[PDB]
Write a protein that holds these residues in place. Structure first.
Motif, PDB file in Angstrom:
ATOM      1  N   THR A 117       0.821  -1.216   0.000  1.00  0.00           N
ATOM      2  CA  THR A 117       0.000   0.000   0.000  1.00  0.00           C
ATOM      3  C   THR A 117       0.864   1.281   0.000  1.00  0.00           C
ATOM      4  OG1 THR A 117      -0.265  -0.019   2.446  1.00  0.00           O
ATOM      5  CG2 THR A 117      -2.096  -1.027   1.174  1.00  0.00           C
ATOM      6  N   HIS A 118       2.058   1.273   0.644  1.00  0.00           N
ATOM      7  CA  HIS A 118       2.912   2.472   0.755  1.00  0.00           C
ATOM      8  C   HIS A 118       4.262   2.078   1.339  1.00  0.00           C
ATOM      9  CE1 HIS A 118       1.128   2.415   4.879  1.00  0.00           C
ATOM     10  NE2 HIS A 118       2.033   3.277   5.269  1.00  0.00           N
ATOM     11  N   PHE A 119       5.221   2.944   1.124  1.00  0.00           N
ATOM     12  CA  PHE A 119       6.594   2.749   1.543  1.00  0.00           C
ATOM     13  C   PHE A 119       6.871   3.240   2.994  1.00  0.00           C
ATOM     14  CE2 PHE A 119      11.276   3.438   1.272  1.00  0.00           C
ATOM     15  CZ  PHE A 119      11.685   2.191   0.815  1.00  0.00           C
ATOM     16  N   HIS A 120       6.273   2.561   3.983  1.00  0.00           N
ATOM     17  CA  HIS A 120       6.592   2.739   5.393  1.00  0.00           C
ATOM     18  C   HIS A 120       7.112   1.364   5.919  1.00  0.00           C
ATOM     19  CE1 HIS A 120       4.124   6.701   6.487  1.00  0.00           C
ATOM     20  NE2 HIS A 120       5.314   6.985   5.991  1.00  0.00           N
ATOM     21  N   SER A 121       8.159   1.393   6.747  1.00  0.00           N
ATOM     22  CA  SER A 121       8.860   0.158   7.119  1.00  0.00           C
ATOM     23  C   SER A 121       8.019  -0.964   7.770  1.00  0.00           C
ATOM     24  CB  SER A 121      10.156   0.487   7.921  1.00  0.00           C
ATOM     25  OG  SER A 121       9.815   1.008   9.203  1.00  0.00           O
ATOM     26  N   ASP A 122       7.056  -0.648   8.641  1.00  0.00           N
ATOM     27  CA  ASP A 122       6.165  -1.674   9.209  1.00  0.00           C
ATOM     28  C   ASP A 122       5.389  -2.414   8.094  1.00  0.00           C
ATOM     29  OD1 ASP A 122       7.058  -1.144  11.843  1.00  0.00           O
ATOM     30  OD2 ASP A 122       5.149  -0.270  12.542  1.00  0.00           O
ATOM     31  N   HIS A 123       5.203  -1.754   6.946  1.00  0.00           N
ATOM     32  CA  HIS A 123       4.496  -2.355   5.842  1.00  0.00           C
ATOM     33  C   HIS A 123       5.360  -3.058   4.811  1.00  0.00           C
ATOM     34  CE1 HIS A 123       0.640  -0.517   7.274  1.00  0.00           C
ATOM     35  NE2 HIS A 123       1.535   0.224   7.906  1.00  0.00           N
ATOM     36  N   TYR A 124       6.550  -2.541   4.492  1.00  0.00           N
ATOM     37  CA  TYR A 124       7.449  -3.208   3.547  1.00  0.00           C
ATOM     38  C   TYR A 124       8.398  -4.250   4.213  1.00  0.00           C
ATOM     39  CZ  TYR A 124      11.217   0.430   4.302  1.00  0.00           C
ATOM     40  OH  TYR A 124      12.204   1.251   4.814  1.00  0.00           O
ATOM     41  N   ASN A 160      -4.437   9.697   0.753  1.00  0.00           N
ATOM     42  CA  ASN A 160      -4.213  10.949   1.554  1.00  0.00           C
ATOM     43  C   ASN A 160      -3.420  10.593   2.834  1.00  0.00           C
ATOM     44  OD1 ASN A 160      -4.477  13.755   2.113  1.00  0.00           O
ATOM     45  ND2 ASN A 160      -6.206  13.332   3.554  1.00  0.00           N
ATOM     46  N   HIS A 161      -2.356   9.808   2.635  1.00  0.00           N
ATOM     47  CA  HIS A 161      -1.332   9.450   3.672  1.00  0.00           C
ATOM     48  C   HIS A 161      -0.011  10.101   3.241  1.00  0.00           C
ATOM     49  CE1 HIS A 161       0.254   7.019   7.034  1.00  0.00           C
ATOM     50  NE2 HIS A 161       0.921   6.227   6.219  1.00  0.00           N
ATOM     51  N   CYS A 162       1.038   9.341   2.956  1.00  0.00           N
ATOM     52  CA  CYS A 162       2.342   9.849   2.514  1.00  0.00           C
ATOM     53  C   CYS A 162       2.382   9.685   0.985  1.00  0.00           C
ATOM     54  CB  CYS A 162       3.433   8.987   3.178  1.00  0.00           C
ATOM     55  SG  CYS A 162       3.454   7.206   2.684  1.00  0.00           S
ATOM     56  N   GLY A 220      -5.306   0.606   3.434  1.00  0.00           N
ATOM     57  CA  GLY A 220      -3.920   0.745   3.856  1.00  0.00           C
ATOM     58  C   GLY A 220      -3.925   1.685   5.043  1.00  0.00           C
ATOM     59  N   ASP A 221      -2.912   2.540   5.117  1.00  0.00           N
ATOM     60  CA  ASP A 221      -2.938   3.726   6.002  1.00  0.00           C
ATOM     61  C   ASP A 221      -3.616   4.882   5.252  1.00  0.00           C
ATOM     62  OD1 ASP A 221      -1.623   2.358   8.054  1.00  0.00           O
ATOM     63  OD2 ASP A 221       0.248   3.470   7.945  1.00  0.00           O
ATOM     64  N   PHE A 222      -4.524   5.604   5.895  1.00  0.00           N
ATOM     65  CA  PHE A 222      -5.221   6.734   5.265  1.00  0.00           C
ATOM     66  C   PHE A 222      -5.599   7.879   6.224  1.00  0.00           C
ATOM     67  CE2 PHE A 222      -9.128   5.170   6.952  1.00  0.00           C
ATOM     68  CZ  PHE A 222     -10.278   5.580   6.317  1.00  0.00           C
TER      69      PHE A 222
HETATM   70 NI    NI Z   1       2.039   4.477   7.255  1.00  0.00          NI
END
Ligand code: NI
Length: 341
Positions: free
Chosen positions: A32-39, A93-95, A115-117
């Motif tokens: 969903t996005h490039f944040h470490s907890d997710h990748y 509308n996150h990063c 994802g994160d929003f």
């Molecule tokens: Ni995030």
């Protein structure tokens, strides 16, 4: 072992599930996005297809060295077929590069994964308007009514006015802004813009920012620290010792630091208006905690969910405790009873 809230039923698909080894029956891995907890778990040795936004794909290739042949970028707002299933990516509308994913299951079920929003009323006029959603995988980060914070616009207005006032009073003041991931770039870009400066930063952070498709970026950032009066540093260094030490390195160009720590929510939000925020000060160093959030407030979350009217909600955040789980399930039922779905 991959948890259930990261699997999409009736598909070969997982979402943000790179830290579990090879997932049984997964034919496509969504990010969903490039944040470490997710990748967490992606690297150059990964050999399954990854589906994500163009921006996220830029970061996978340049920062984590994932090979091009496994990166599948998709355009936003466009119906796409992945392994026999219709998908759409929507702006979260996150990063930068962050997306929500709509899955149109072969049996007619429709699933939205946020994802994160940060929910916004503009999402009520995206491609979500046109059809029913059965299941919602929800970013529940701030799912409780104590979580209030201002708009991003109000917060930036505070920061620009603060920075401009200080540097106009003292032309030898340095502004410093903290960072530990992508997101919240508006804080430092807005302040540099009002001051007529570029933002100075390390080579590694400049590299990350060059992947984000920001217009006119070469005009706003630089690795030449000496030509810049807005500097970016790691978040960990935004404290009196760390900043003193930085000020030593500037070679008597500056005699004052004004520094910003963009946090999410803090308990000082339960009392103090944005207008009334004050710094912590030691000598010629001041530090402002500003509540710039890239997640929904409780009220913004509630409004999105009551508009969407999902038949089932599956939280993706705060799932580890029984007390958290029970709290969230009570709010979901209130929302449903109040609105009538
Ligand atoms: Ni995030």
């Amino acid at each position: 072992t991959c948890p259930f809230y990261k699997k999409i039923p009736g598909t070969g698909f997982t979402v943000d599930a790179f830290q579990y080894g090879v997932v049984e029956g997964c034919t496509a891995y969504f990010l969903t996005h490039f944040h470490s907890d997710h990748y967490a778990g992606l690297s150059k040795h990964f050999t399954f297809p990854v589906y994500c936004s163009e921006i996220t794909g830029n970061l996978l290739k340049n920062k984590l060295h994932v090979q091009e042949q496994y990166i599948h970028p998709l355009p936003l707002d466009t119906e796409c077929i992945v392994n026999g299933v219709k998908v759409v990516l929507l702006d979260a509308n996150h990063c930068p590069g962050a997306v929500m994913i709509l899955f149109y299951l072969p049996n007619g079920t429709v699933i939205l994964h946020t994802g994160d929003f940060r929910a916004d009323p503009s999402m009520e006029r995206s491609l979500l308007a046109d059809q029913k959603v059965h299941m919602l995988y929800l970013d529940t980060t701030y799912c409780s009514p104590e979580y209030t914070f201002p708009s991003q616009q109000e917060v930036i207005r505070f920061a620009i006015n603060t920075a401009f006032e200080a540097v106009t009073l003292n032309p030898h003041a340095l502004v410093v802004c903290g960072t530990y991931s992508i997101g919240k770039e508006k804080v430092f870009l807005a302040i540099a813009d009002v001051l007529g400066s570029k933002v100075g930063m390390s080579q590694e952070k400049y590299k990350t920012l060059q992947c984000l498709n920001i217009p006119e970026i070469n005009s706003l950032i630089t690795t030449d620290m000496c030509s810049s009066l807005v500097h970016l540093l790691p978040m960990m260094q935004i404290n009196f010792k760390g900043l003193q030490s930085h000020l030593k390195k500037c070679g008597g160009k500056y005699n004052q630091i004004l520094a910003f720590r963009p946090t999410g929510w803090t308990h000082s939000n339960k009392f103090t208006r944005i207008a009334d925020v004050i710094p912590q000060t030691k000598g010629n160093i001041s530090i402002y905690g500003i509540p710039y959030s890239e997640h929904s407030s409780y009220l913004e979350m509630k409004r999105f969910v009551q508009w969407l009217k999902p038949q089932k909600i599956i939280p993706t955040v705060n799932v580890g405790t029984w007390k958290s789980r029970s709290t969230m399930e009570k709010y979901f039922r209130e929302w449903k009873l109040e609105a009538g779905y």
